[PDB]
């Protein structure tokens, strides 16, 4: 199948490679196997099941709500590209230093990172407005991905430095994302809504934490994982990161909006100290509408 030079002869006892002068790029590095047929088979199964979940979430969302649909929209377009051109440039970039860069992965990330982080800043769906913190989250997260993608394209000590720059931005993002979830938890009603927020927190930090781990493990890092191996790992954390989290999001949103339909918008003033933070606690009781300084 390949549309770089794949046919060559060894000359002078393999010290010289001779290739047709047909204008095609050539590098032996590009031709290294992507992994075993078993790894490939496992990856194609998880991909179909990802396509199925992406398809069902979209139709389900068909029955405010723009962030969840979009992530499933991007995810379906992703699978049609994977199905036709997963290992074709520029879904994979084959570069002059011999690297394989999965641009397909990083592109999806940059496209939906605003969508996800806006959704992070809007778990309840009630806010019309976003604080200063949201803005720092977006700037830090996009820096992370840009430094990391630079690290994937680089080699040796230059790859190390850009990874480190990505990590520094990443830590700032993780720190502030933690505060958001804390605020969300003490904002939503006391019952099922706080189970779902807790569910979303776990999914978010485990799935987001696994990305730098799979970077260091993959061809972009210490090459422990094969390409199919990395795909399989990505499909699992992909399902968690996108489909499942947006599904939990939509679910949470429904619960909160139905709370306004039954009890109404009854806010409180839970002053947290996890510092000197403040929160508007939705409650099911009209009576409860006052300042609860819960210093953590």
Q: Which positions touch its own copies (CB under 8 A)?
A: 3-4, 10-11, 14-21, 23-30, 70, 89-90, 93-98, 103, 107, 110-111, 113-115, 118, 128-132, 134-135, 138-139, 142-143, 145-146, 149-150, 153-154, 158
291 phi and psi, to 5 degrees? Answer: -85, 115
59 contact partners, CB below 8 Å, separation of at least 6: none
- Closer to ligand RET by Cβ: residue 213 or 289: 213
Site size for ligand OLC (CB under 6 A): 43
Closest CB to ligand RET among 145 and 266? Answer: 145
111 Cβ neighbours under 8 A, 6+ residues apart:
74
User: For residue 164, what are its two tokens?
Assistant: 């480190």
Choice from 145, 184, 232, 279 touching ligand RET (CB under 6 A)? 145
Judged by CB under 6 A, does residue 77 bind ligand OLC?
Answer: yes
20-29 contacts at long range (C-beta below 8 A, 24 or more positions apart): 25/94, 27/94, 27/96, 27/98, 28/98, 29/98, 29/99
Residue selected from 154, 187, 207, 241 as contacting ligand OLC according to rule CB under 6 A: 154
Q: Which of 195, 183, 32 is nearest to 121 (CA)?
A: 183
- Asked if 35 and 225 touch (Cβ cutoff 8 Å), the reply is no
Residue 208 contacts ligand RET per CB under 6 A: yes
Told to check if 139 binds ligand OLC by CB under 6 A, we report yes
Cα 211 from chain centre: 8
Question: Which residues of the chain form contacts with ligand RET (CB under 6 A)?
Answer: 108-109, 112, 116, 144-145, 148, 166-167, 170, 208, 211-212, 215, 241-242
């Amino acid at each position: 199948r390949m549309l770089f030079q794949t046919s060559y002869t060894l000359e002078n006892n393999g010290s010289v490679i001779c290739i047709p002068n047909n204008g095609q790029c050539f590098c032996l590095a590009w031709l290294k196997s992507n992994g075993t047929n078993a790894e490939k088979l496992a990856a194609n199964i998880l991909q179909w099941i990802t396509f199925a979940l992406s398809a069902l979430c979209l139709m389900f969302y068909g029955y405010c709500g723009w962030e969840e649909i979009y992530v499933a929209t991007i995810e379906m377009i992703k699978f049609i590209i994977e199905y036709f051109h997963e290992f074709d440039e520029p879904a994979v970039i084959y570069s002059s230093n011999g690297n394989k860069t999965v641009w397909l992965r990083y592109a999806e990330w940059l496209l939906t990172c605003p969508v996800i982080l806006i959704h992070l800043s809007n778990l309840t769906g009630l806010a019309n407005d976003y604080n200063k913190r949201t803005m720092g989250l977006l700037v830090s997260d996009i820096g992370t991905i840009v430094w990391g993608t630079t690290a994937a394209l680089s080699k040796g000590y230059v790859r190390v430095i850009f990874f480190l720059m990505g990590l520094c931005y990443g830590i700032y993002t993780f720190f502030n994302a933690a505060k958001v979830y804390i605020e969300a938890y003490h904002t939503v009603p006391k019952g099922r809504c706080r189970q779902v927020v807790t569910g979303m927190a776990w999914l978010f930090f485990v799935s987001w934490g696994m990305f730098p781990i799979l970077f260091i493990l993959g061809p972009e890092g210490f090459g422990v994982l094969s390409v199919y191996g990395s795909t399989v790992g990505h499909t699992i954390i992909d399902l968690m990161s996108k489909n499942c989290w947006g599904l939990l999001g939509h679910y949470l949103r429904v619960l909160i909006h139905e709370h306004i339909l039954i009890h109404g918008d009854i806010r409180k003033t839970t002053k947290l100290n996890i510092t000197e933070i403040e929160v508007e606690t939705l409650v099911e009781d009209e009576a409860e509408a006052g300042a609860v300084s819960s210093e953590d």
